[PDB]
């Protein structure tokens, strides 16, 4: 019953350990409880993200047993729970909230292989909110020198608009 609240930094050896937050539930309420009753309110969002990364990462010293925030397209539409970036970069899609928080923090992180093409949808089509956010970021001057992405996104948007029946 205690496994829900305090939750010290995760440390596993090779036995059977299952603690921290929620213990294999929904990532939304998991992160909610993590922000509520885990770290003290003096901590920041960056510290909470680093703690969650050290929690669901395999670099803690053994085997993780938590969950990873999956990109929600409908009802938890990602790939597995509790996977370090080294095991996610193969093909597993990363989170969107973590990417947004990292972009708000500093724009000095890698963005070429990040940013999933899915605009919170199970299908990769419809680049509405994604294009809106990208244009807002380009106007606020926070992206990077890479015109190929903008070109392919504009081409895909023009194709979708000419398919649905729009010109202007």
């Amino acid at each position: 019953v205690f496994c829900l609240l305090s939750g010290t930094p995760v440390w596993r050896s090779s036995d059977n350990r299952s603690i921290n937050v929620c213990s294999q539930l929904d990532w939304k309420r998991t992160l909610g409880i993590h922000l509520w009753y885990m770290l003290p309110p003096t901590a920041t969002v960056a510290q909470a993200l680093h703690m969650y990364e050290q929690a669901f990462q395999e670099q803690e010293g053994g085997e993780p047993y938590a969950c990873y925030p999956l990109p929600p397209y409908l009802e938890d539409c990602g790939f597995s729970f509790g996977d370090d970036p080294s095991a996610k970069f193969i093909s597993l899609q990363r989170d969107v909230c973590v990417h947004l928080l990292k972009l708000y923090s500093e724009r000095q992180y890698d963005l070429c292989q990040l940013l999933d093409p899915s605009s919170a949808t199970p299908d990769p089509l419809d680049y509405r909110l994604s294009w809106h956010m990208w244009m807002v970021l380009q106007a606020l001057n926070y992206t990077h020198l890479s015109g190929h992405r903008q070109g392919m996104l504009h081409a895909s948007y023009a194709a979708q608009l000419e398919n649905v029946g729009l010109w202007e």
């Binding site: 000095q108 992206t143 020198l145």
Partner: protein
Amino acid sequence: ISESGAPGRSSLDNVEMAYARQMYMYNEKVVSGHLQPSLVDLCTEAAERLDDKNVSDLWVMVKQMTDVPLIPASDTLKSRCSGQMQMAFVRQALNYLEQSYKNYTLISVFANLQQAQLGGVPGTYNLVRSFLNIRLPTPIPGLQDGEIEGYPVWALIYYCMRCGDLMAAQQVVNRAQHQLGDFKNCFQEYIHNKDRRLSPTTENKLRLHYRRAVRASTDPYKRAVYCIIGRCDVSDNHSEVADK
């Protein structure tokens, strides 16, 4: 031109951004006090993660060439004044050029696949034979003694020398029992001696034979092999002046 500093927040290059982030992590580790690994490996992994491939392979080559067991000098003046490090770097550059030719042969094999005029077969000798069959499978004019499975022995030896596969060269020499003259022992000694020790009298005899007879044959590979064995002149060109 270059990636100059943009006024405030704007848009820079992903390569420079990743390099600055890795330098920031290096400075953080320095401030912490723990011993840092090496920024070269971090730059290599960043170039491999990035979408760029040409500069990534270039930096991979630079890292593999700099990872030679050499003493770190202080300045270019000291490096050019020291003589041992110069010849050591020259030997390492020759070894890495042989390795790069082997990698280029492997890439050509991967491009030619398997079912295309005897494709690449696992094993160094088999890969060299497949590359020879892809390049020139027909018997080149100027053949001496016999052949190995109908393949030019001189061209095979030249390809083995250019690739640097000394074990494959030893296998070729062992396979060419009656398909060659009485220089199989000399070839074996030249392969087994890293400092090239195959008797000074035998070397002088081979040089004299090359200067007397082997000077106008129609086999450029055989001519180059005999020249390399006999150690004659400083530069012997036959048909390599063609963007290679």
